[PDB]
Nucleic acid binder design. Structure first.
Lengths: 52, 174, 195, 207, 52, 198, 175, 171, 49
RNA sequence: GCUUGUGCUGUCUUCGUCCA
C-alpha cells in the first residue's frame, strides 16, 4: 500500500524524483519509513547532465 | 435413495407458510408430521427418541444383529466393527461416541421411568413428542433456560415444567 | 507434541526459505566482454510439443526489453530449409542476439537444441556488437514461469494478436533477461511452484 | 547476485522428462510399450518417451529356446527392470527376466534396525495378510437324479433306516465337488458309504 | 501404533510407510528431520496412526 | 401481507415493483444475480440493512454483497461448463513434479486430488499445464501381468480390497472411479500392482 | 510489514522492566535454539574469552534496534552489520572477524519479538487474577514458579494451581 | 434429533443370484446400502431395527432385462437436524475463521461472525482456542450451539451453528 | 474427408477412363475454401484451409 | 523413423413397381 501511495505522489509532483531528500522535503514519506528505504532506492546519475 | 411411505403431493397453485423446516415453530414438514401411516395404512403418531431411548435401541439392535451373525453365541468398538461398510463403520462410531459422551441415562429402568413420566403425565398429554425428546435430551435445569432453548414450550404454560425438570435431574445419575 | 511440532515447523520454514532464496537469487546472463548485470539481447526458439505438425516460433528481445521481429518457420526443422532460414534470420543486420535459449514440452526439444547448436558451431555464428569474436551460446531455459505466463490474462492483454507459443517464447526471453521480475509477475501463482 | 544458473545433465533430464533422477534409476521396474522385435534385440518406448533397449540375453529365460519373434509382438506392453540409464542421451537398457522384474520389491531403503523397527509386529501383520489372501469362495453342489438327496452321512443313514435293505441314496461327498458318495443299506442299522471319483466333468454341478 | 485404518491403508506406495513400525526414536533427533515428524502428525490427523 | 391480524393475512394486494424491497432472513440459501461474485450461493449470516453478508458454498468463505444482487435460490445447481481450461476429471499437471485429477470444478478455483491422496485447492492460472497423454501411454499392467486399459473394471486384493473402473493412468498409479466411495465422488488412487482385473 | 505483524498485538509498547525481561527472554530463546553454533564458537575460538557475552550484547542490541528504532531486517543487515560481528587481533597480529549473527537469525529475532507479547499478556492476566485473589500472605510456590516461568504452558499450570487451591475466592468473584 | 421412520428401498437382483440364499443376500445388500448412508430428505440413517427378519416380498421380473426388482420395507432409526434447534457438540478443529464441531456424523461449522467477541481466538495457545476471561473452548471441549442453517448436498448434509445467544458456548 | 479412396484421382482431380471403380470410391475431387482456424499458432504444412 | 484419415440436406413436383 505504501508503494502505490509513493508512486501516486511521484506522479502528482511530476513523475521524476530529483534527489533522495525529496522523499522528506516534499512530505512524500515519513521519517522512519524514509530512514529504512533511503539506501535501497537509487536515482541514476548521468555526469553529462549534471556538470555542477 | 430410500422412499417414504407418503406419496402423491402433485402440483397445485396455492403456497403455504407451513412448509419450511423450523424447530421453534414446530413445523417439521410433511415427512415428519404428527400423523404418519404404517405399511398397513393405519394411523400412526410421530415417534421421537431421546438420546437415552436412541442409545438403548441402537445397542439392542446392534447386539441382536451381532448375536444372530455369530450363530447365537458390550464393547462399542467391536460392535461398530460388526456392521459392514467403512463409511458406515465411521458413522456408527461417531454416533456411539456422541451418545456415550452425552448419555443422560445409561440404564434401561431409568429410561423406562423417564419415558413413563414424560408420557403418562396429564400436562405432557398435550406436549409434542419433539418437545419431550428435547427435554429428555438437552438436560435443562431451569424453566427459563428451557423456554429460551425451546421456544415452543413458551406457549404451553399449563405444564408443571419445574417439578418435571427436578424429577429428571433426580433420575439423572450424578 | 505441540513443542516438537512448532520446532519442526520452524526448521522446515527456514529450509523452505533457503530453498526459495536459492531459486530466486540469479543475475541476468552476462554477455562476454561486458560488465556483469548488463541486460543481454535474447533470441528464443520452441516448436511446442515436438509433434509432426508443430512449427518453430522465434522471438527476439533486445537489451531494452522490447520484443522485436517475431517470425514463423514453415518447414520441417530436420531439413536443410530450416537451417538456411535460421542462418538468414540470425545473420540479418537488424537482429544481433547475445544468447539463444531453447525450451520445450518433451524430449523432442533435444533434437532442436542439437540442431541449433550444430548449426551455430558449423556456420560460426558469432555475436555481432554492431577484434575477439565469440560464438552465440545455446542453453536450456528453465520454464517454471513461462508456462504460467502464457496463460495469464496480463500477457493476453499485452499481446492480443499472438498465439500461446509466442507468449511462451516471450516468457522464456523475459526469464533470461530478469528472473526476479518474472518470478514477481506470477503474483499469487508463485506459491504453487516446486520450491 | 550469483551468476546465471546453467542446467546440468540431471536438471536437463528433469526438465525434459518430468522424471527426477531419483524416481528413474537402476533397479526400478516400469511398464514399457514394445515397438520393435528382432532376433537379438528389442526396442521399447517408456511412458515418458525414453527409448529403451533389451538384448537377447535379457529377453528370454535361460531354459527357453524359442525365437524372440514367436514370444512377443509389436504393440504389446510388458514389465521390465532398468539395468542402466544414460541421462544425457535419454536412453536406457532393460531386462525382462523373472529374477529382475519380480523379486526386486523392496525398492526403498527403510531403516529396519531391530532397535528402531518393530520387526515382530510387521512379521505378524504380514503373516495375517497372507492368511487373509488365502481366503476362498465355496458353495454347495446341486445334482438332478431320482435317488440323489442333499443329506449328510448320518442323515442318509436315517433316511435309509425307514427303507428296506437294498434301497440306494446318493449324497454329495466331503472330498470335493469332483467326488460323489453313494450310500446303500447293507443291513438293518448297517450302511456302506462308497466314494466315486468323477472324471471329464463338464461342470462342478454336472455329472 | 496403528489403528485399523492405518493397519489397512498403510501401503508401500504411501509416504507414511517410512514410519509405519517405528520405535525408540529420541525426541532430540526429531528436529534434524522435520519432515518425518510432520508426516507422522499428518498421518495422526487422518486417524491412521497414534504417536505415543 | 403478513400481520398479527388474521383477517388482514387473507388479503392479496397488488403493489408496484418500484416500492418493494426484498427481505433476507438469516440462514437462507441465496444465489447472487450479478457482480464479481456472480452465481455464488450460500447461507445468510449477517443482515446489515443494505449490505448482506453470507458464507459461500463454493469458496466456503464469507462474502459481502449488496442486497440488490441476491435471489433466494434454495439450491445452487451451478454448471461449470464454458469456464477455465479444464473439464471435470482432467489429469492436470500441477507443477514440475506434481500431478493430480480435478475432483470438483468452480468458477475461479479447482479441487485436485494428488497421486498420493492429498487434496489441493488452486486457481486455474496456478496449474502448470494439462497432460494430454497418448492412448499408448495410457496403458498399465496389473499384478498378474494382464493388460488393463482405461474403462476396464479392476478390483484390489491388498488393503481394503476396493473396486473401481479405470479413469486415468499415470506411471504406476491408477485413478479409479467407484460407486460406493462417496467421499471424493468415487475417485481414489491406487497403484496398478495392488489390483487384479475382472 | 511491521504493521501487518503487529496488527494482532493488543498493546506493543512495553514498560522498562517488561522490555528488559523481553530482551532476556529473547537472549535465552536464541541460546536454546543456537546451541550447536554456540558450541562451535566456543570450541573453535577458545583463545577469545567471553564470546557468549558478546553474543548476548549483540542480540540485545538487535532487539533494541527492532523494538525501539523499528529497523527492518535488510536495513540492519546492511547498515548495522558491525553490531552483528566481533573482531580481534590474535598473537600473530592477525585480524580475525567472527560473524555472530546472520540474516535468518535477525528474522528469528523478529519472530521471537512477535511471540513474546502473548507470553506478556498471559503473565499480566495471571498477575491480575492473583491481585483479585488478594492473599493475606504471598504464596511462596506461586512467586517461586512465577518468577522463573518463561512459557505459556507453565503460566497455564500456575493458573490451574490458583483456580484449584483458591477455588472459593474464584467462586466469590464469579463448576 | 432421532426418530423412528418406516422406510422403503428398491433392490434390483441379477439372475445369477437366483438361489436358495436369495433372501439373505438381499438382506445383506440392503444393510450395506442403507446403514451409514446420508440422504438430505431424511437425514442420517444409523441402524435398521430387526435387520435379520425384514420381509422382502416377491420380486417382479423386469421385461427385457431378466433381473428381478424387490420392494423392501423396513423400520430404521433416523437422525436429522432442524433449523433453530439447540444441541450439544464437541469441537473437532480450531481455525481463525471459526471452529468446526461434530454432532455425531454431522460436522457443523460456526463462523466468527456468529461467535461473541469476548471469545477471542488465541493461536499461540497450546492447543489453539477461542478463549475469554472466564471461558476457554478448544479441541475436545463440550459446546452447546444452536443450528441456524442446514445445507443439503447429494449424499451429505452441512450444518451451520451459532453460539452468540444465551445458554450457549462452553458447557 | 470421406471414407473412400482417393488414389484413383489424377492431378486435376478427375478420374481417367478405363479405371475400375467400386462403391463410395471418389471419382470427382472438389474442395471449397474455409477461413483458417487459430492453426497459425504454427502448423508448417498441416493447417487446414 | 515412419505411421490412415472417420460422413449428409430439406421441400415440392412428376414418372413408375406390387396389390387393390
Amino acid at each position: 500500500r505504501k508503494a502505490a501511495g509513493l508512486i501516486q505522489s511521484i506522479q502528482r509532483i511530476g513523475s521524476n524524483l530529483v534527489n533522495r531528500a525529496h522523499l522528506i522535503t516534499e512530505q512524500l514519506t515519513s521519517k522512519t519509513v524514509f530512514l529504512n528505504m533511503a539506501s535501497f532506492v537509487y536515482i541514476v546519475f548521468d555526469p553529462d547532465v549534471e556538470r555542477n | 435413495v430410500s422412499t417414504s411411505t407418503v406419496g402423491a403431493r402433485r402440483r397445485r397453485a396455492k403456497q403455504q407458510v407451513d412448509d419450511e423446516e423450523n424447530a421453534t415453530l414446530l413445523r417439521l414438514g410433511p415427512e415428519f408430521a404428527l400423523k404418519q401411516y404404517d405399511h398397513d395404512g393405519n394411523e400412526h403418531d410421530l415417534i421421537a427418541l431421546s438420546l437415552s431411548e436412541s442409545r438403548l435401541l441402537i445397542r439392542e439392535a446392534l447386539k441382536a444383529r451381532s448375536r444372530a451373525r455369530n450363530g447365537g453365541v458390550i464393547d462399542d468398538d467391536e460392535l461398530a466393527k460388526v456392521t459392514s461398510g467403512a463409511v458406515a463403520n465411521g458413522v456408527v462410531k461417531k454416533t456411539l461416541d456422541y451418545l456415550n459422551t452425552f448419555a443422560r441415562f445409561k440404564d434401561e429402568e431409568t429410561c423406562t421411568a423417564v419415558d413413563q413420566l414424560l408420557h403418562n403425565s396429564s400436562d405432557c398429554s398435550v406436549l409434542h413428542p419433539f418437545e419431550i425428546a428435547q427435554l429428555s435430551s438437552l438436560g435443562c435445569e431451569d424453566v427459563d433456560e428451557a423456554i429460551t432453548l425451546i421456544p415452543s414450550l413458551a406457549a404451553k404454560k399449563e405444564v408443571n415444567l419445574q417439578r418435571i425438570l427436578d424429577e429428571l435431574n433426580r433420575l439423572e445419575d450424578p | 507434541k505441540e513443542s516438537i511440532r512448532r520446532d519442526c515447523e520452524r526448521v522446515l520454514y527456514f529450509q523452505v526459505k533457503n530453498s526459495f532464496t536459492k531459486k530466486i537469487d540469479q543475475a541476468p546472463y552476462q554477455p562476454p566482454t561486458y560488465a556483469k548485470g548488463t541486460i543481454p539481447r535474447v533470441l528464443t526458439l520452441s516448436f511446442g510439443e515436438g509433434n509432426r505438425g508443430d512449427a518453430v516460433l522465434g522471438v527476439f528481445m533486445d537489451d531494452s526489453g522490447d520484443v522485436k521481429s517475431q517470425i514463423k518457420f514453415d518447414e520441417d526443422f530436420q531439413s536443410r530449409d530450416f537451417s538456411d532460414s535460421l542462418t538468414r534470420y540470425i545473420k540479418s543486420n537488424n537482429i544481433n542476439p547475445d544468447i539463444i535459449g531453447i525450451s520445450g514440452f518433451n524430449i523432442h526439444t533435444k533434437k532442436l537444441f542439437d540442431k541449433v547448436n550444430e548449426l551455430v558451431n558449423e556456420e560460426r555464428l558469432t555475436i555481432e556488437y554492431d577484434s575477439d569474436k565469440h560464438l552465440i551460446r545455446v542453453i536450456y531455459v528453465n520454464d517454471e514461469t513461462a508456462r504460467l505466463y502464457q496463460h495469464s490474462s496480463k500477457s493476453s492483454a499485452e499481446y492480443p494478436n499472438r498465439p500461446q507459443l509466442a507468449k511462451y517464447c516471450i516468457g522464456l526471453a523475459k526469464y533470461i533477461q530478469s528472473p526476479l521480475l518474472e518470478y514477481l509477475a506470477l503474483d499469487e501463482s508463485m506459491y504453487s511452484l516446486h520450491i | 547476485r550469483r551468476d546465471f544458473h546453467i542446467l546440468n545433465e540431471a536438471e536437463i533430464f528433469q526438465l525434459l522428462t518430468r522424471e527426477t533422477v531419483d524416481s528413474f534409476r537402476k533397479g526400478m521396474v516400469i511398464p514399457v510399450y514394445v515397438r520393435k522385435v528382432e532376433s537379438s534385440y528389442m526396442s521399447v518406448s517408456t511412458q515418458s518417451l525414453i527409448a529403451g533397449n533389451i538384448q537377447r540375453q535379457d529377453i528370454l529365460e535361460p531354459n527357453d529356446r524359442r525365437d524372440p519373434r514367436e514370444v512377443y509382438s509389436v504393440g504389446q506392453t510388458v514389465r521390465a527392470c532398468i539395468l542402466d540409464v544414460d541421462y544425457y542421451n535419454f536412453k536406457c537398457q532393460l531386462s525382462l527376466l523373472r529374477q529382475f522384474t519380480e523379486n526386486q520389491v523392496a525398492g526403498l531403503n527403510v531403516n529396519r534396525n531391530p532397535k528402531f523397527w518393530d520387526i515382530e509386529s510387521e512379521n505378524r501383520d504380514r503373516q495375517e495378510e497372507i492368511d487373509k489372501q488365502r481366503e476362498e469362495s465355496r458353495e454347495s453342489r446341486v445334482i438332478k437324479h431320482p435317488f440323489f438327496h442333499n443329506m449328510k452321512s448320518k442323515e442318509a443313514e436315517d433316511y435309509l433306516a425307514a427303507r428296506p435293505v437294498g434301497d440306494v441314496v446318493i449324497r454329495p461327498s466331503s472330498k470335493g465337488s469332483n467326488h460323489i458318495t453313494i450310500s446303500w443299506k447293507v443291513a438293518p442299522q448297517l450302511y456302506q458309504h462308497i466314494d466315486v471319483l468323477e472324471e471329464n466333468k463338464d461342470d462342478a454341478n454336472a455329472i | 501404533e496403528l489403528t485399523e485404518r492405518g493397519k489397512l491403508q498403510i501401503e508401500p506406495e504411501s509416504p507414511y510407510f517410512d514410519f509405519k513400525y517405528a520405535k525408540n526414536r529420541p525426541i532430540s533427533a526429531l528436529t534434524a528431520t522435520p519432515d518425518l515428524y510432520l508426516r507422522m502428525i499428518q498421518a495422526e490427523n487422518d486417524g491412521l496412526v497414534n504417536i505415543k | 401481507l403478513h400481520s398479527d391480524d388474521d383477517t388482514i393475512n387473507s388479503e392479496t394486494v397488488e403493489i408496484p415493483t418500484s416500492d418493494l424491497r426484498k427481505i433476507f432472513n438469516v440462514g437462507d440459501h441465496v444465489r447472487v444475480i450479478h457482480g464479481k461474485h456472480t452465481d455464488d450461493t450460500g447461507l445468510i449470516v449477517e443482515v446489515n440493512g443494505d449490505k448482506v453478508e453470507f458464507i459461500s458454498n463454493q469458496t466456503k468463505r464469507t462474502v459481502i454483497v449488496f442486497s440488490n444482487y441476491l435471489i433466494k435460490s434454495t439450491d445452487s445447481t451451478v454448471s461449470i461448463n464454458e469456464s477455465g481450461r479444464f473439464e471435470l476429471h482432467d489429469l492436470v499437471q500441477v507443477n514440475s513434479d506434481l500431478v493430480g485429477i480435478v475432483i470438483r470444478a468452480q468458477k475461479d478455483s479447482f479441487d485436485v486430488l494428488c497421486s498420493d491422496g492429498k487434496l489441493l485447492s488452486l486457481p486455474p492460472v496456478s496449474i502448470y499445464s494439462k497432460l494430454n497423454l497418448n492412448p499408448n501411454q495410457q496403458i498399465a499392467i496389473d499384478s498378474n501381468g494382464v493388460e488393463v486399459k482405461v474403462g476396464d473394471t479392476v478390483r484390489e486384493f491388498t488393503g481394503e480390497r476396493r473396486q473401481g473402473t479405470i479413469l486415468h493412468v499415470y506411471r504406476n498409479f491408477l485413478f479409479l472411479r467407484s460407486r460406493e466411495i462417496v467421499e471424493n465422488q468415487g475417485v481414489f488412487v491406487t497403484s496398478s500392482n495392488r489390483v487384479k482385473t475382472i | 510489514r511491521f504493521q501487518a505483524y503487529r496488527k494482532s498485538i493488543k498493546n506493543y509498547k512495553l514498560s522498562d522492566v517488561d522490555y528488559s525481561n523481553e530482551r532476556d527472554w529473547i537472549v535465552e530463546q536464541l541460546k536454546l535454539e543456537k546451541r550447536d553454533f554456540l558450541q562451535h564458537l566456543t570450541q573453535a575460538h577458545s583463545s577469545v574469552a567471553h564470546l557468549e557475552e558478546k553474543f548476548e550484547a549483540s542480540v540485545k542490541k538487535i532487539v533494541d534496534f527492532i523494538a525501539i528504532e523499528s529497523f527492518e531486517v535488510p536495513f540492519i543487515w546492511n547498515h548495522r552489520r558491525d553490531y552483528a560481528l566481533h573482531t580481534y587481533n590474535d598473537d600473530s597480529n592477525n585480524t580475525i572477524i567472527v560473524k555472530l549473527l546472520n540474516e535468518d537469525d535477525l528474522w528469528r529475532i523478529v519472530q521471537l519479538d512477535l511471540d513474546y507479547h502473548s507470553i506478556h499478556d498471559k503473565k499480566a492476566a495471571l498477575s491480575s487474577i492473583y491481585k483479585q485473589l488478594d492473599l493475606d500472605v504471598v504464596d511462596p510456590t506461586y512467586e517461586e514458579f512465577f518468577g522463573s516461568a518463561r512459557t505459556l504452558s507453565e503460566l497455564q499450570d500456575i493458573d490451574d494451581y490458583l483456580t484449584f487451591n483458591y477455588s472459593s475466592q474464584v467462586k466469590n468473584l464469579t463448576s | 434429533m432421532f426418530f423412528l421412520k418406516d422406510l422403503s428401498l428398491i433392490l434390483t437382483l441379477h439372475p445369477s443370484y437366483f438361489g436358495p440364499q436369495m433372501n439373505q443376500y438381499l438382506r445383506e445388500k440392503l444393510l450395506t446400502d442403507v446403514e451409514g448412508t446420508c440422504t438430505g430428505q431424511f437425514g442420517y440413517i444409523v441402524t435398521v431395527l430387526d435387520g435379520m427378519n425384514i420381509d422382502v416380498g416377491k420380486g417382479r421380473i423386469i421385461p427385457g432385462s431378466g433381473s428381478a426388482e424387490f420392494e423392501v420395507k423396513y423400520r430404521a432409526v433416523v437422525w436429522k437436524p432442524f433449523k433453530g434447534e439447540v444441541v450439544d457438540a464437541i469441537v473437532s478443529n480450531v481455525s481463525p475463521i471459526g471452529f468446526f464441531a461434530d454432532v455425531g456424523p454431522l460436522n457443523v461449522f460456526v463462523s466468527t461472525r456468529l461467535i461473541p467477541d469476548n471469545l477471542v481466538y488465541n493461536p499461540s495457545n497450546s492447543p489453539p482456542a477461542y478463549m475469554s476471561n472466564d471461558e476457554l473452548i478448544t479441541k475436545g471441549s463440550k459446546v452447546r450451539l444452536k443450528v441456524v442453517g442446514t445445507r443439503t448436498d447429494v449424499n451429505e448434509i452441512y450444518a451451520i451453528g451459532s453460539i452468540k445467544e444465551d445458554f450457549l458456548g462452553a458447557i | 474427408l470421406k471414407h473412400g479412396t482417393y488414389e484413383k484421382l489424377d492431378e486435376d482431380g478427375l478420374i481417367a477412363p478405363g479405371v475400375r471403380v467400386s462403391g463410395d470410391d471418389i471419382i470427382i475431387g472438389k474442395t471449397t475454401p474455409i477461413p483458417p482456424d487459430t492453426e497459425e499458432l504454427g502448423q508448417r504444412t498441416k493447417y487446414h484451409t
